[PDB]
Amino acid sequence: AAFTVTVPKDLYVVEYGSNMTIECKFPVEKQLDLAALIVYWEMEDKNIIQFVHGEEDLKVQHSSYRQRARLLKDQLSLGNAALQITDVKLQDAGVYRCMISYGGADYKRITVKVNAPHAA
Amino acid sequence: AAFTVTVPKDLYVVEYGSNMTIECKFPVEKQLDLAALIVYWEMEDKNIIQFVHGEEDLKVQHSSYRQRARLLKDQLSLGNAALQITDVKLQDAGVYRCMISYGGADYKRITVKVNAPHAA
Amino acid sequence: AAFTVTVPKDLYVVEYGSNMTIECKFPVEKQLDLAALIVYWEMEDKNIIQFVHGEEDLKVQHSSYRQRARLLKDQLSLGNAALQITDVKLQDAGVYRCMISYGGADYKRITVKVNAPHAA
Amino acid sequence: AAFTVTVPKDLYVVEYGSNMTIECKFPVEKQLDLAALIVYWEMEDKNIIQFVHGEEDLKVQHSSYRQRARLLKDQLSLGNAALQITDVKLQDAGVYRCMISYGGADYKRITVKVNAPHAA
Amino acid sequence: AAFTVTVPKDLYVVEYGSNMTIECKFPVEKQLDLAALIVYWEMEDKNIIQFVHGEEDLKVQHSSYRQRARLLKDQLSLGNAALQITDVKLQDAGVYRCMISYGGADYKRITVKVNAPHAA
Amino acid sequence: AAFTVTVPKDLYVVEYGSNMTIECKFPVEKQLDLAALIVYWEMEDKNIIQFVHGEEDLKVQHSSYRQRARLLKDQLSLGNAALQITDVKLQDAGVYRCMISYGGADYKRITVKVNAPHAA
Amino acid sequence: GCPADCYEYCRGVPFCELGWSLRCPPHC
Amino acid sequence: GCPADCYEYCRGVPFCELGWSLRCPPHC
Amino acid sequence: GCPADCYEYCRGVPFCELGWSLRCPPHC
Amino acid sequence: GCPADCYEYCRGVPFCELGWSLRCPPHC
Amino acid sequence: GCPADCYEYCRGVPFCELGWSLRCPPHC
Amino acid sequence: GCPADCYEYCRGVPFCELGWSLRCPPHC
Ligand SMILES: [Ca+2]
Ligand SMILES: [Ca+2]
Ligand SMILES: [Ca+2]
Ligand SMILES: [Ca+2]
Ligand SMILES: [Ca+2]
Ligand SMILES: [Ca+2]
Ligand SMILES: [Cl-]
Ligand SMILES: [Cl-]
Ligand SMILES: [Cl-]
Ligand SMILES: [Cl-]
Ligand SMILES: [Cl-]
Ligand SMILES: [Cl-]
């Protein structure tokens, strides 16, 4: 099969203030060569995750996601580039993109909608 | 395009005691003429929201939804007649209908299922 | 119609530590003959529910589901074999099967995926 | 239930020069009062079918559909306002609308796409 | 995995007088033991195919399907119990059922709708 | 929006010996710069279309598709890279890929299944 | 039978009399 | 502008004036 | 009532008696 | 190999021997 | 205009220049 | 092994070397 990036779900509707995990899958034959894996997560014009050389590089991470966004490293060996974002706000609504380079390269879009908060 | 009312989602499965936002969208060209907008929300034979002349009229609101149901006014300018209902119970399961009159008129049905509570 | 077991939803994505209700429906004409109803719930090679003769038999229930899994008896008269599992963990991910014998017999598969927990 | 018009299928992809039947369903309790049934079919700004008083009125039928479009009368008693169009061309691509008045009134949209012809 | 029968498509809309192939798949590990395979196709209360002991038994085939229905034997080794029916008429509309016994047993339903013919 | 290639339909089931049009769409702002457009169609390890510099290059086209496959040039200005294949056979079943380079680059997969022929 | 205030409910909208309202059906 | 025979087309149905007809828009 | 040859039809398979066959229902 | 109490588990139902039970497979 | 550090962001990946990055568009 | 004319096929596009082409795989 050709190198393809796939998303099990391309539309998330999350409640205000909750935590969400948007998932993105890439092919991992045999074992995982972590050195060759590059994972970029970004929504709109802001970077969220720049995973290069086995670590997350914070150089270009948008300040909104400081201590709020996380890429589970241990799931990468299963071909899962799952992105976690906690305490989502209305500014987190938009189109996310998941760009993965591991031998080949591909990307998919994911749409997230955030509901308005419920009053007291 | 013809005047149409649309629902991004026509089947909600909500947990007992949670809060839900069922959404309903209508076309808003240019700015919003609030005086001409009429929004009715009702499930089964009970009215939930009677939004006329820019305000919610409680004259026919079913008593179950007193201080429990809300129509976010600020989203109406975006063409969003989103209905919020808090602390949903098993009596909230059924078919909701969203009737909107703004120049033209249309309506759509939404089905809500409420799970039984989980014991201690 | 032929005797068929149906699932309103065959793929659940639940958050770590939450409670879920996976549903399974069978035909109930007239009233319910509880004596003739047999309901088995099992995921992977472990039994979860063995509902025979109007009661749950714990003889073969996997120890993971002790005081954690429940079959709502009162919904059986509506043709609903809904399974509740509380405080789901990563070990709860897999394929569940719902086997119902009531006059005839049928079964359906349900897939449950459990997200990783969100850190502090 | 409220008076609703429904479409079993809202997107048709038909081959050039073929015949298509786009279907539209309305509720018929008991027998059918043909005198009270009004069925309008139109795509873009052109009328296709004006079924009033038990017959098709050709007064406003677009000339493209002369001896090309037909509303099967015998299926109306089953609640089926099925529209047949033969020898479809590229000009037949667009959004059709199905407007039915029988006690109440409702309408739904259907999108038809016509493929380009295959060469010799 | 448990023994399951699956259908790639559970709703067919076919034109009057055309030929259709409704498909039904069962698991074939290693090679195929043809002696152990039993395939029943039936719609409503009429049998269409009774494939036992490597051949079709016409003893109970409904006369409507004489020289009209066929089960492609060569695809059975691929786990494909595909049913072909030629020159379909309005009487062919209904719910088909595909019952397969090969070690285990399972069945699935398929709905076929036949359009009315287009006039001259 | 980011440069993306999209498919309105990713699974085609075609009858033996018929003609099919599998579609693939790319973004065309303003007018179309034909010189910059590159379109590759290939299924399995065989090239079908190599559209470079405004013309189809037959240098690497698989011989099966000689005078059988066609890319409608006139639809490219609408952002439609639609592929036509006539007289499809069982060898035409598999996964097609649509690779488009126009400023950016992207690709999508399409699965085609071909039914067995119906006998006399 | 019929709920109260259906006149105020329906006189300004086509929702009733088009079969859209279960609270105030067309012929209650 | 506006097609002919919209009066006969619309006087008996709510399809026009509810924004459902493109042939006879509410204000043509 | 019941069609003929249901005995040959059902004696070798669980399809009948599990409610799967409309031709030979479990209690015809 | 095979779990215990599969006899009580399977003797009253067709779930096993039809390939439906992974706990008690048809030939464990 | 263009954000900073797009050179480090793009020099090792095809994501930019293929139109995939909105942070660093192909011609910012 | 590797088909002919993959050089002309791949030198102008990123389709190969990104794993998109089965005709000319990245390392044929
Ligand atoms: Ca009154
Ligand atoms: Ca006039
Ligand atoms: Ca007999
Ligand atoms: Ca035992
Ligand atoms: Ca720089
Ligand atoms: Ca070469
Ligand atoms: Cl009154
Ligand atoms: Cl006029
Ligand atoms: Cl008999
Ligand atoms: Cl044992
Ligand atoms: Cl810069
Ligand atoms: Cl070479």
PDB file of C-alpha atoms and ligand atoms in Angstrom, chain I residues 3-9, ligand 3:
ATOM      1  CA  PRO I   3     -44.736 -25.140   2.841  1.00  0.00           C
ATOM      2  CA  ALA I   4     -43.673 -28.610   1.813  1.00  0.00           C
ATOM      3  CA  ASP I   5     -40.134 -29.993   2.130  1.00  0.00           C
ATOM      4  CA  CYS I   6     -39.359 -27.867   5.187  1.00  0.00           C
ATOM      5  CA  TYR I   7     -38.055 -31.047   6.842  1.00  0.00           C
ATOM      6  CA  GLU I   8     -35.324 -31.472   4.225  1.00  0.00           C
ATOM      7  CA  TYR I   9     -34.893 -27.686   4.314  1.00  0.00           C
TER       8      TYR I   9
HETATM    9 CA    CA M   3     -41.736 -32.632   4.845  1.00  0.00          CA
END
